[PDB]
Design an enzyme around this catalytic site. Structure first.
Site, short mmCIF file in Angstrom:
data_model
loop_
_atom_site.label_atom_id
_atom_site.label_comp_id
_atom_site.label_asym_id
_atom_site.label_seq_id
_atom_site.Cartn_x
_atom_site.Cartn_y
_atom_site.Cartn_z
N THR I 30 5.24 37.01 17.31
CA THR I 30 5.15 35.73 18.42
C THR I 30 5.43 36.69 19.94
O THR I 30 5.77 37.76 19.78
CB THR I 30 6.54 34.82 18.31
OG1 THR I 30 7.52 35.63 18.21
CG2 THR I 30 6.35 34.18 17.02
N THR I 31 4.96 35.91 20.98
CA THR I 31 5.24 36.23 22.19
C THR I 31 6.35 36.54 22.60
O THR I 31 7.59 35.48 22.39
CB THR I 31 4.30 35.33 23.09
OG1 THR I 31 2.91 35.10 22.59
CG2 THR I 31 3.98 36.22 24.42
#
Ligand code: CL
Lengths: 241, 231, 250, 195, 244, 235, 111, 240, 243
Positions: I30-31
């Site tokens: 995920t970012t």
């Protein structure tokens, strides 16, 4: 073909892992240069900050090992810092044990011996770096000693490292063929830095701004790196003659 | 393929196949369900037998008066991990006179499982765990995967056919979370949840295993005729 | 971590060959030529200072090394392997001998200790053999002057004269014609310079040649006076000037 | 324990060793055999601190018996005594030394000679014609100095030994409850059941 | 991890053989021949140096015959460096025994000890075995004169006459033919040299290509003398026996 | 090669699964639990007539209240038995009581997965652990090299296991007597054995609360074999 | 010199009836001539219908009780919630005390 | 330390290293054990490929573990020395801690345990050796004969053989050895042992070693001539 | 070939393929981002809501080291936790010996050397995480980002995970449009926006925003989580910008 994965001999008597570590050395695409003056040793290196998000002040391949010794590295930064930390620890231990500052060539030898061990012992890989140590030694004077992944080291009158090392090397060779001396006959370190930059410009065929270079200077009893503004003053003097 | 010989090897796409194979052992294991309200937390486990002469393998383990888990996969690995939890719960009590927080118990399990995934010679754990507990911040439910990932949830299920029970809990979310001060109705919701994962077989008296912990309820396990009430 | 390579990396092949030793010998073959000649009143060891770059100061790189005051060494093959062997050889001369008997070891026994180290790299776990062949020249009271060769296997042989590395086959033939049991040290130095010229391509002078002798005691190199029995080291490295002087009478 | 004597005659070695064992103020046993057969033609008597004596003796016995089986051969008395001395000299600088003094009586079948070795707990070994440990020598050595010959028969050796025990029984404050006597010769080891 | 690169030196073949031991024996078969012959009044050790040079210093050289103590000596076939590791261990064992029992070590006890060390490298540790075969020539007062051999397997056997190294098949046939039990040392010396002269891969057998030793009670009265032959003495015995 | 503690793509430990194949080659062992006791019986399977069959010890006492039968690589079982006996007696030392059959079994199973790169491989033997305690009465456990143990009313392990287990499926009920169980083990052993069953190539044993664990005499078993033959000829 | 032991005083009393048992102890804790506490409990309920009191050096007494209570907990875990009988607890405590035979728990204990 | 797992299971449930160790035993010289009514005899083959041997000093095939127990073997010779040494140490260790000599069964159980340990320990390979262990328990006149093998299993035998061509001599023993009436005397027992080896040996000269062990630590090795008389008598009866 | 099967093996290029494969695990995650502001730093992360059964605000991803350093990472979460556990040991032993809290550059090298150590042997696997971390020390604010190779640099803005390209583009605009600098409260708002904009690469499942910060003025140089009204204010600002 597992003789290419670990540091054991091939049928030709070669260590392929050592040879491939030499190739990792140029992965940064940076060229470095070192020269000696009368009272000083100057090291310059290309600085490339490709990303705008980077803090350019933290991007460096020049290290202050001890008060007297500086080190520039050609190779990936993780291995560079590995070597830097070890060299700092070794230099400090040496002073504690033997009561005087570790000489530049002795540190180079010590780091070279460590590198040799990685070429003989299987569980340890070589570091993909070439280490150029500089100082003004209290016995030997201005000093340049360079270590590589093979465990090889030697002193230099001047030297160059990187993808375009050969062009810089020949340029320096030709100057010392004219002057017929083992150093830059100049009083101030400011002019020795100007020489180093000028001859890198000539050899690479590229112009430099203040943020394109990184400079280290060794004098008696201290090694220090130049700021961007110190380099700018150096670049202005070059252009004005 | 070439990158599944050991746990110390990434694949070219950045996958760890030995960990994924350990994850596969959980899917082969018998189904177990976990769910909670604000006052209580419940484990429901479908036990598996070898044949008609054999007993039904126990699925639920107690870790402390306020904490315990249910297993799915290699049972010996659950014994090793539950034994570790027992010790950590116990270290917290003896040294700090403090009941171990369920969230911190999850962090400890995560870190223990992780060491087995980064080192040569060892292997990942081949078991998934559902930890329930009641601590100073109320009721809790955790899902442990041997990859190291631990997740705090309202409800969940692991094992074979666990997707059916998980969908049910995803629908029932707003209902069962509100079941406060009623242990029997919370267990009913768990028994109804695990029923969505059954095929051919049904819940019998020596098949079903239930555990509960809550506000004024120590972690207790129910087997045999003690679960006939819920069949 | 931990060194998990606790098994031999050098093993017998079906034909009875120890591959890694053979390959180490191949690395030695590629190396620069070095030689040793024994005279009646001395020994001479010599090699070429193959400089990697003209910017490099080749005086800082020492191919010929003092091990004890009366023992010296030179190599062919991998330089870094040689450097660490010299460090170990110097130390073992103290720990396993001088600190016990109060005197420096005789040539043959120091050679034996170096050989042992190289043998262990051939059998111990997780290591390759050393990629060098050594020529060790020395003197001691009861054995006189001597010259030994040490190979990657750990085997060592005493020589009257020999050569190792690049042009060893040609050089050993050259030495067989010139050597006799009546040579004086200066005659041996002369033969060493002649033999070494054949294997060198480029410049041939005091700055590109490294040459040392085991000869008479040097009281001028001792560093102190007052003890009659201490007469100074027999090992001496010839200077750049001293070599060039003998190249005019060549 | 207390008194252990030894005498080497023409064709045998005779060892005499007290029978008493005392715990506190009470004599627990008056028939104790302070000796171990190390090999068919080698006997070792012992005296020192409680416990250590037997543990050491049995430990030596096991080692010599192990050697005998491995090589199918009996070690010479000299070889055994040197092994024992080394074990004691090793022991004296240990954390807790073994406080045991021994006499080793053996018949060397190769040389056809009896041999008596005296070794104290420090590892001090001496070959003797007659020996003793502790205070035993103070009373007995004057008699042995006077009466001993190297060409004595076994019977004469026993008579001289009786005179030594009688002197001990007269002038020692401690009652050691008589002695068990054993003879070591070419035919092996045997015990004199009436003494 | 590291397993990938492990040769596994201590494993059986499907036929029940130890690979590395068999290959080490193959190595030894290329080594210079060494011969031992036992007589009633002494033992002979003869061995061939491998293709030497004129510039080799022979009188200070030792590659084949080594002294373990005053009563026991060995002839080497295989890697010299490997042999020296073992030889120094054997010298220490002999001195340990002498310190403990105050008697010189019996020959077989020393041989068994070295053979046990070799055995260890074939069963555990994961290291390559020693590429060495020994011929032990010794004397003690129990069995008198004794010849033994040991090989990388750690197996040892006693002999009246025996060869190791190159051409042992040919050499053993020649010894078996001419050997007799009532033989004497001077006769055994002649047999050893004659056997080497016929089995050698060289064009001719000369003094510079030989190492020679005898263990004799030819020492003044009941005692034993070891004689490591000098280059000139080997040259003389070659003329005496009529080979050169 | 590959790790000893490696998972297969199906989520099973290779080495554990392979050890199970070695157990299938082992001689048959059968256990039957009743309310009057637990019976343990084994096939001796002597490789030659010169082998003195009474020296084949495939049924073993762990404590007075716990017995054990084995199948597979029987040499591997010796250290397991040694640990079991030590655990049983050590618990008696610490707690002045008999140890529970389950707790003993669990202690044995804890060894199972202590292998890696501890021992170098899993055990190549399965155990039928039978016993009695005051809390759970007469019990029969099957201890595998996987570290898993199942309790059984009746169980067969070894080469004739799946054929015997199908037979035990039909024959076992909760009201079996000890005498009925004895004959049942003999019946099923005789069915799956290669050679003809007699008192010399098969062995019986039992554990009762009163008399504890007992291995049967060859004379005692011989009578139970003769009793079996007659009752099968009776219809 | 550091003295690892102390004396916290106190007195305890256990009496076995026909179908009951009592374990009594005073609540005073002291050092020398000073009172530390007038109410510091000394007799504890350890579970499984067992009561224990370790009188003497309070630090060692507290440590022993703490370890036995812990031993009861692990007895349940390891042996299927079986009740620890009084005779079994006694034998277990013997081994707890003898672990320190050469640096003892300085307490006279009663259960 | 070197920890590598050399003895491991294969897909079919076999430990190949242990099975290949049995192949080393198959290669070894033939050894045979026969127990009579009041004795046990151990016979051993000596391969006659090796002449010029010194039989005085050459390691004998039968080894005394204690004064009342002996051990013979088939397989790797170097490996057998390690087992014998361990056995001899354990024998003295038992006498030292328990004050009785080992029973033949106990000694066998120990040696077999050592062999087993080497089949599931890291870094080591199995012993390429099978042993025959014989003797009489202290103050007991019943003969004892046991066999061990690389896997670590052991058992008692009325008569048994191991090593090369052991299949043939076992065939002989199975038809010639009667359990109801074992060789009543020493003569009959030795005769049957020599006969069994003559099925395989080649020449009855220095190829057959015989060792007789009787009760109460009475162990003797027969000489060449004594054995040769058995060899002579057997074939003279055969010519009929 | 076979150079990519073992860690610490140089390929003929001079590359360690095992480290490059670890980067793929990071890119899969995920970012997560970091923003350096006037007197501090702001960290933000995308938390994918796999199911409704996930308890909101409970599965906390950002971790604190000491009391002045924040750490966030993308990739294999357990690997990140292991790295922070080491980070905490390093920070403790520094403070134990030297009294002062560990400086951010000093702390960065401690992690850097440890991660680099896991590229030196075949007996260990490289880290499957890129870590963004930083805080306030005596010399002011510092932001760092650390890769599986052990490589790290100082940053004005940093981003990693599946939506790193999108994030980087947004960070570059802020650097250009604010040469004088960004405030701590502004940086929190911008951080929220960037995570929302970077969520287009993970648009299948909806997500939960998590933000933390160290600021000399706003938090007294201590690491704190953005909670309640300030978090909601940032979410509103972020939601307004995407529409
Ligand atoms: Cl160094």
């Amino acid at each position: 073909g597992y003789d290419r994965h670990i540091t054991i001999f091939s049928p030709e008597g070669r260590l392929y892992q050592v040879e491939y570590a030499f190739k990792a050395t140029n992965q940064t695409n940076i060229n470095s240069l070192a020269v000696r003056g009368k009272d000083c040793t100057v090291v310059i290196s290309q600085k490339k900050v490709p990303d705008k998000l980077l803090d350019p002040t933290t991007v460096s391949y020049i290290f202050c090992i001890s008060r007297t010794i500086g080190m520039v590295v050609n190779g990936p930064i993780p291995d560079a810092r590995n070597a830097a930390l070890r060299a700092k620890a070794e230099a400090a231990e040496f002073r504690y044990k033997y009561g005087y500052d570790m000489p530049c060539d002795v540190l180079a030898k010590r780091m070279a011996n460590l590198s040799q061990i990685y070429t003989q012992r299987a569980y340890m890989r070589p570091l993909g770096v070439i280490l150029t140590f500089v100082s003004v030694d209290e016995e030997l004077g201005p000093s340049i000693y360079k270590t590589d992944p093979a465990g090889y080291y030697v002193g230099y009158k001047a030297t160059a490292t990187g993808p375009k090392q050969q062009e810089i090397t020949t340029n320096l060779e030709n100057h010392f063929k004219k002057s017929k001396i083992d150093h830059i006959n100049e009083e101030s370190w400011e002019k020795v830095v100007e020489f180093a930059i000028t001859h890198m410009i000539d050899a690479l065929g590229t112009e430099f701004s203040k943020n394109d270079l990184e400079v280290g200077v060794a004098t008696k009893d201290k090694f220090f790196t130049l700021s961007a503004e110190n380099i700018e003053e150096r670049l202005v003097a070059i252009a004005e003659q | 393929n070439n990158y599944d010989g050991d746990t110390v090897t990434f694949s070219p796409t950045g996958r760890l196949f030995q960990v994924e194979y350990a994850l596969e052992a959980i899917k082969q294991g018998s189904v177990t369900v976990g769910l909670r309200s604000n006052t209580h937390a419940v484990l429901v486990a479908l036990k598996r037998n070898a044949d008609e002469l054999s007993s039904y393998q126990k699925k639920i383990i107690k870790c402390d008066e306020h904490m315990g888990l249910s297993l799915a996969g290699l049972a010996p690995d659950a014994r090793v991990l539950s034994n570790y939890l027992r010790q950590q719960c116990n270290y917290s009590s003896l040294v700090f006179n403090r009941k171990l927080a369920v969230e911190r118990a999850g962090h400890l399990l995560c870190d223990k499982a992780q060491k087995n995934t980064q080192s040569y010679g060892g292997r990942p754990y081949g078991v998934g765990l559902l930890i329930i507990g009641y601590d100073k911040s109320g009721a809790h439910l955790l899902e442990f995967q041997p990859s190291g990932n631990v997740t705090e949830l309202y409800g969940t299920a692991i094992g074979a056919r666990s997707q059916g029970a998980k969908t049910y809990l995803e629908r029932t979310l707003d209902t069962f979370i509100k079941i406060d001060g009623n242990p029997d109705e919370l267990i009913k919701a768990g028994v109804e949840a695990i029923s969505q994962s059954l095929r051919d077989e049904s819940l019998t008296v020596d098949n079903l295993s239930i555990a509960i912990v809550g506000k004024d309820t120590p972690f207790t396990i129910y087997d045999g005729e003690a679960v006939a009430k819920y069949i | 971590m931990t060194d998990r390579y606790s098994f031999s990396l050098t093993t017998f092949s079906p034909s009875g060959k120890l591959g890694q030793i053979d390959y180490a010998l191949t690395a030695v073959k590629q190396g620069v030529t070095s030689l040793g000649i024994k005279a009646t009143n001395g020994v001479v060891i010599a090699t070429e200072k193959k400089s990697s770059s003209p910017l490099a100061m080749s005086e800082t790189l020492s191919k010929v090394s003092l091990l004890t005051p009366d023992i010296g060494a030179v190599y062919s093959g991998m330089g870094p392997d040689y450097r660490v062997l010299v460090d170990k050889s110097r130390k073992v001369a103290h720990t396993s001998y001088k600190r016990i008997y109060g005197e420096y070891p005789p040539t043959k026994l120091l050679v034996s200790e170096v050989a042992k180290i190289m043998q262990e790299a051939t059998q111990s776990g997780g290591v390759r053999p050393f990629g060098v062949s050594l020529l060790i020249a020395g003197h001691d009271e009861f054995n006189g002057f001597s010259l030994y060769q040490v190979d990657p296997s750990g085997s060592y042989f005493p020589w009257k004269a020999t050569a190792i590395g690049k042009g060893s086959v040609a050089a050993k033939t050259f030495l067989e014609k010139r050597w006799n049991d009546e040579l004086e040290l200066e005659d041996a130095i002369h033969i060493a310079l002649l033999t070494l010229k054949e294997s060198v391509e480029g410049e041939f002078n005091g700055d590109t040649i490294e040459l040392a002798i085991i000869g008479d005691e040097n009281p001028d190199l001792l560093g102190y006076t007052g003890i009659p029995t201490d007469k100074g080291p027999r090992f001496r490295k010839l200077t750049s000037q001293e070599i060039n002087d003998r190249l005019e009478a060549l | 324990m207390d008194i252990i004597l030894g005498i080497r005659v023409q064709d045998s070695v005779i060892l005499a060793s007290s029978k008493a064992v005392t715990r506190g103020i009470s004599v627990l046993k008056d028939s104790d055999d302070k000796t171990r057969q190390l090999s068919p033609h080698t006997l070792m008597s012992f005296a020192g601190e409680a416990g250590d004596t037997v543990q050491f003796a049995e430990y030596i016995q096991a080692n010599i018996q192990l050697y005998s089986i491995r090589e199918d051969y009996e070690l010479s008395p000299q070889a055994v005594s040197s092994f024992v001395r080394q074990e004691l000299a090793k022991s004296i600088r240990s954390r807790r030394p073994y406080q045991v003094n021994v006499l080793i009586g053996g018949y060397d079948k190769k040389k056809n000679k009896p041999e008596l070795y005296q070794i104290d707990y420090l590892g001090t070994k001496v070959e003797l014609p007659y020996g003793a440990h502790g205070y035993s020598g103070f009373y007995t050595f004057s008699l042995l100095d006077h009466h001993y010959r190297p060409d004595m028969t076994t019977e004469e050796g026993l008579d001289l030994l009786k005179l030594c025990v009688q002197e001990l029984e007269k002038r020692m404050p401690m009652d050691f409850k008589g002695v068990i006597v054993k003879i070591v010769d070419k035919d092996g080891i045997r015990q004199v059941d009436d003494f | 991890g590291s397993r990938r690169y492990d040769s596994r030196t201590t494993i059986f073949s499907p036929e029940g053989r130890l690979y590395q031991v068999e290959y080490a024996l193959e190595s030894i078969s290329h080594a210079g021949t060494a011969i031992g012959i036992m007589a009633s009044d002494g033992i002979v050790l003869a061995a061939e140096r491998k293709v030497t040079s004129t510039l080799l210093e022979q009188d200070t050289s030792t590659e084949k015959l080594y002294k373990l103590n005053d009563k026991i000596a060995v002839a080497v076939a295989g890697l010299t460096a490997d042999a020296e590791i073992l030889i120094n261990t054997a010298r220490i064992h002999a001195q340990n025994y002498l310190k403990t029992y105050n008697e010189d070590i019996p020959v077989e006890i020393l041989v068994r000890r070295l053979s046990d060390i070799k055995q260890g490298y074939t069963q555990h540790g994961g290291l390559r075995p020693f590429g060495v075969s020994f011929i032990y020539a010794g004397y003690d007062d129990r069995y008198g004169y004794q010849l033994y051999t040991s090989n990388p397997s750690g197996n040892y056997t006693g002999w009246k006459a025996i060869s190791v190294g190159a051409n042992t098949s040919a050499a053993q046939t020649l010894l078996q033919m001419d050997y007799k039990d009532d033989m004497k040392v001077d006769d055994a010396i002649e047999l050893a040299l004659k056997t080497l002269s016929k089995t050698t891969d060289s064009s001719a057998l000369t003094y510079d290509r030989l190492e020679f030793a005898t263990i004799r009670k030819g020492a003044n009265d009941g005692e034993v003398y070891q004689k490591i032959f000098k280059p000139q003495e080997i040259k003389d015995i070659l003329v005496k026996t009529g080979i050169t | 090669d590959r790790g000893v503690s490696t998972f297969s793509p199906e989520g099973r430990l290779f080495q554990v699964e392979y050890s199970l194949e070695a157990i299938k080659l082992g001689s048959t062992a059968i256990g039957i639990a009743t309310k009057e006791g637990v019976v343990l019986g084994v096939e001796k399977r002597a490789t030659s007539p010169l082998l003195e069959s009474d020296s084949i010890e495939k049924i073993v006492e762990i404590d007075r209240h716990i017995g054990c039968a084995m199948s597979g690589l029987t040499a591997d079982a010796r250290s397991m038995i040694e640990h079991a006996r030590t655990a049983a007696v050590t618990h008696n030392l610490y707690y002045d009581e008999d140890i529970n059959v389950e707790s003993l079994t669990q202690s044995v199973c804890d060894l199972a997965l202590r292998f890696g790169e501890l021992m170098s491989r899993p055990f190549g033997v399965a155990l039928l652990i039978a016993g009695h305690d005051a809390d759970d009465g007469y019990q029969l456990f099957h201890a595998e090299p996987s570290g898993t143990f199942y309790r059984y009313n009746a169980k067969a392990i070894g080469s004739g296991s799946e054929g015997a287990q199908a037979e035990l499926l039909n024959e076992w009920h909760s009201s079996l007597t000890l005498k009925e169980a004895e004959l049942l083990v003999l019946k099923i052993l005789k069915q799956v054995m290669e050679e003809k069953l007699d008192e010399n190539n098969a062995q019986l044993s039992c554990i009762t609360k009163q008399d504890g664990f007992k291995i049967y005499d060859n004379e005692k078993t011989a009578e139970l074999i003769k009793e079996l033959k007659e009752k099968e000829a009776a219809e | 010199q550091f003295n690892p032991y102390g004396d916290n005083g106190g007195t305890i009393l256990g009496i076995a009836g026909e179908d009951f048992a009592v374990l009594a102890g005073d609540t005073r804790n002291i050092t020398d001539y000073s009172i530390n506490s007038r109410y510091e409990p000394k007799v504890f309920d350890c579970g499984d219908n067992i009561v224990m009191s370790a009188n003497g050096f309070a630090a060692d007494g507290d440590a022993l009780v703490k370890r036995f209570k812990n031993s009861v907990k692990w007895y349940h875990f390891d042996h299927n919630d079986k009740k620890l009988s009084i005779n079994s607890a006694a034998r277990n405590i013997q081994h707890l005390l003898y672990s320190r035979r050469f640096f003892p728990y300085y307490v006279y204990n009663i259960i | 330390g070197y920890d590598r797992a050399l003895s491991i299971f294969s897909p079919d449930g076999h430990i190949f290293q242990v099975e290949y160790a049995l192949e080393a035993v198959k290669r070894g010289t033939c050894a045979v054990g026969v127990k009579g009514k009041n004795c046990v005899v151990l016979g051993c083959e000596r391969r006659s490929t090796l002449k010029l041997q010194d039989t005085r000093i050459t390691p004998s095939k039968v080894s005394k573990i204690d004064s009342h127990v002996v051990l013979s073997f088939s397989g790797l010779n170097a490996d057998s020395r390690i087992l014998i040494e361990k056995a001899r140490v354990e024998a003295q260790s038992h006498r030292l801690t328990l004050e009785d000599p080992v029973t033949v069964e106990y000694l066998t159980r120990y040696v077999a345990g050592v062999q087993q340990r080497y089949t599931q320990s890291g870094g080591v390979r199995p012993f390429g050796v099978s042993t025959l262990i014989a003797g009489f328990d202290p103050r007991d006149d019943e003969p004892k004969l046991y066999q061990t093998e690389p896997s670590g299993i052991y058992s008692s035998w009325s008569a048994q053989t191991i090593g090369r061509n052991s299949k043939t001599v076992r065939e002989f023993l199975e038809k010639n050895y009667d359990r109801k009436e074992p060789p009543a005397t020493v003569e009959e027992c030795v005769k049957l042992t020599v006969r069994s080896l003559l099925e395989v040996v080649q020449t009855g000269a220095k190829n057959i070693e015989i060792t007789v062990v009787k009760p109460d630590s009475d162990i003797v090795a027969l000489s060449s001539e004594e054995i040769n008389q058995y060899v002579t008598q057997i074939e003279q009866e055969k010519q009929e | 070939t076979g150079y990519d099967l073992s860690n610490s093996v140089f390929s003929p290029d001079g590359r360690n393929f095992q480290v490059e494969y670890a980067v793929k695990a990071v890119e899969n995650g995920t970012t997560s981002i970091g923003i350096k502001c006037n007197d501090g730093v702001v960290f933000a992360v995308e938390k994918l809501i796999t199911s409704k059964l996930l308890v909101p605000q409970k599965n906390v991803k950002i971790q604190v080291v000491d009391r002045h350093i924040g750490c966030v990472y993308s990739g294999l979460i357990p690997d990140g936790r292991h790295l922070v556990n080491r980070g905490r040991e390093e920070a403790a032993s520094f403070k134990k010996l030297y009294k002062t809290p560990i400086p951010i550059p000093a702390f960065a090298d401690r992690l850097g050397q440890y991660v680099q150590a896991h590229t030196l042997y075949n007996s260990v696997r490289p880290f499957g995480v890129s870590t963004i971390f930083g805080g306030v020390d005596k010399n002011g604010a510092h932001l760092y980002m650390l890769e599986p190779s052990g490589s790290y640099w100082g940053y004005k803005g940093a981003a990693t995970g599946k939506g790193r390209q999108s994030a980087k583009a947004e960070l570059e605009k802020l650097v250009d449009h604010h040469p004088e600098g960004l405030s701590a409260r502004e940086a929190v708002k911008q951080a929220a926006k960037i995570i929302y904009l970077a969520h287009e690469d993970n648009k299948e499942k909806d997500f939960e925003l998590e933000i933390s910060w160290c600021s000399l003025s706003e938090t007294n140089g201590l690491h704190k989580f953005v909670k309640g009204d300030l978090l909601q204010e940032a979410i509103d600002f972020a939601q307004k910008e995407i529409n």
